[PDB]
Amino acid sequence: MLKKNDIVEVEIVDLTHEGAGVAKVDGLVFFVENALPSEKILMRVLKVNKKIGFGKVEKYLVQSPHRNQDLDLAYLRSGIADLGHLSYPEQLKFKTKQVKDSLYKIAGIADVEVAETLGMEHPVKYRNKAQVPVRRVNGVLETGFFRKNSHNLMPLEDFFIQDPVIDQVVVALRDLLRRFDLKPYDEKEQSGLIRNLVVRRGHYSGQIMVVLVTTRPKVFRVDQLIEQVIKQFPEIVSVMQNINDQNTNAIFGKEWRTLYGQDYITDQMLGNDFQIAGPAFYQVNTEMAEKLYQTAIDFAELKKDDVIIDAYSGIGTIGLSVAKHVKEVYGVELIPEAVENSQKNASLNKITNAHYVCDTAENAMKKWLKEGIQPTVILVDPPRKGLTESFIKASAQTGADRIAYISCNVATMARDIKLYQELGYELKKVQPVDLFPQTHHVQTVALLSKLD
RNA sequence: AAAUCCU
Ligand SMILES: Nc1ncnc2c1ncn2[C@@H]1O[C@H](CSCC[C@H](N)C(=O)O)[C@@H](O)[C@H]1O
């Protein structure tokens, strides 16, 4: 019978989907941070529960051959790069395995093709967006990242997985906030002004948005602070402000203001251009998203007489990438600022067959089913939570030949696939694509197809 | 349960 602060020798024999090592000691399953399969360790017992436990590595007796000894990545492991300690080919194997394991555990599929995960040539310096808290650490305003399961800011200049320019811009903005004596936010004391900095930068265009996320509308000498950052970085076309007065883990509140220039950046994906608002979603890994889409598009086998639904449209990138190669494109997007981009993105690219509606995807499908639209293909790309039961049920009743499901969470996709199978759709292909190198997150594309 | 970390 184990208990807190005991040290025991264990072999790690698996990984959780989130990246934590698994060892099984005396009826307990232990989740050990920074422990890879086959590693011998002395495990410190942190917490004992009924069926599970939690552990810390006290000593490595034997490490993995697949361990990455990079000391620079180890600082990030407890946070933004939670799989950095595993070598890249094995990360890919791990992610492929996770997709297979989820389709079985959740949906009872063992017989379907799951191609190996498509990885990056150079899996670094990829993210086009960065969200960076601003905090006081030892009486000094610092940008960085939060330690896992915490709000303790780890000071950091080199983010490893982000666009190097974004790191330069965030370091510049940190130094400017220090010089202008603008107070960082304190969560516990509920005092200060500057909560987070959000910096999006177009993968091809290089055009930069800077969102200053603050506790109150009034920012003291912000016009001068912008004036200086534009001289360092001429590529800033937009400086936005966001007010968030709540005590919440959520980044933005309701109010968005434009402090300078445009209220959008412009970037390329596949052939076309796309305007992108601050509150709108843009795929963080443009390089691999283009691949993610090109897989989905090839899976969909598009004819000129097809009628596509692009559910969870965003700024319209999937729908508009295919609109010139088909009859009609209908899309739905809940966030007004994104679906307004989507409308302009259609006009920019000369696409007059791209019709959009601002609503929940659940509701848009219900109206489109009543209104008598005849969709042949359905592309879906929901957030982690996945799809609603009512959306799956409605989409089945449209009699759509193919459904292509893009996902950033295989757990919810496996569930939702399970329900598509109960309504006469069959899972044909699956291709995982590594949008998030050095992290536990798997992106996926699954082709469902109907039976007569 | 909103988003790479952001209980
Ligand atoms: N119930 C709902 N109905 C429609 N859209 C929703 C929704 N819940 C969240 N969303 C939206 O779904 C989108 C998911 S991500 C959008 C992906 C887009 N195709 C792109 O690659 O750019 C977000 O834009 C989000 O605002």
Residue numbers in the entry: 1 to 452
Question: What do the study's own words say?
Answer:
In this research, using protein-RNA crystal structures, we demonstrate that multiple structural determinants collaborate to establish the dual enzymatic activities of RlmCD, which has been previously shown to catalyze C5 methylation at both U747 and U1939 of 23S rRNA in some gram-positive bacteria. However, in S. pneumoniae and Bacillus subtilis, which both belong to gram-positive bacteria, RlmCD and its homologue YefA have been proven to be dual-functional methyltransferases to catalyze both m5U747 and m5U1939 in 23S rRNA. We previously determined the crystal structure of apo-form RlmCD, which highly resembles that of RumA and contains three individual domains, including the N-terminal TRAM domain, central domain, and C-terminal catalytic domain. In all structures, the cofactors were modeled as SAH, due to the missing electron density of the methyl group, while its density was clearly observed attaching to the base C5 atom of U747 or U1939, indicating that the complexes gained in the crystal structures all exist as the trapped enolate intermediate 3, given that E443Q eliminates the final step of proton abstraction from C5.
A similar RNA design was also applied to co-crystalize the RlmCD with SAM and an 8-nt U1939-containing RNA stretches (5′-1936AAAUUCCU1943-3′, U1939L) to understand the mutual recognition between RlmCD and U1939 site on 23S rRNA. Interestingly, in the RlmCD-SAH-U1939L complex structure, the U1939-containing RNA substrate also adopts a very similar conformation to that of U747L, even though their sequences are totally different, suggesting that both RNAs were re-shaped by the catalytic groove of RlmCD to adopt an optimal conformation for protein-RNA recognition and subsequent catalysis reaction. The nucleotide base-flipping was also observed for U1939 in the RlmCD-SAH-U1939L structure. Compared with U747, U1939 in the structure of RlmCD-SAH-U1939L exhibits a totally identical interaction mode with RlmCD, suggesting that the catalytic mechanism RlmCD employed for two different RNA substrates are quite similar. As the corresponding nucleotide to G748 in U1939L, however, U1940 maintains only one hydrogen bond with the main chain hydroxyl group of Q131 using its base, while the Q131 main chain is also involved in two additional hydrogen bonds with the bases of C1941 and C1942, respectively. N249, whose side-chain originally makes multiple hydrogen bonds with the bases of three different nucleotides in the RlmCD-SAH-U747L structure, forms only one side-chain-to-base hydrogen bond with A1937. The most striking difference between the two complex structures of RlmCD is that the aromatic side-chain of F145 in RlmCD-SAH-U1939L swings away from its position in RlmCD-SAH-U747L by an angle of ~135°, without disturbing the base-stacking between U1940 and C1941. In addition, the side-chain of F146 also shifts by ~1.4 Å away from RNA nucleotide.
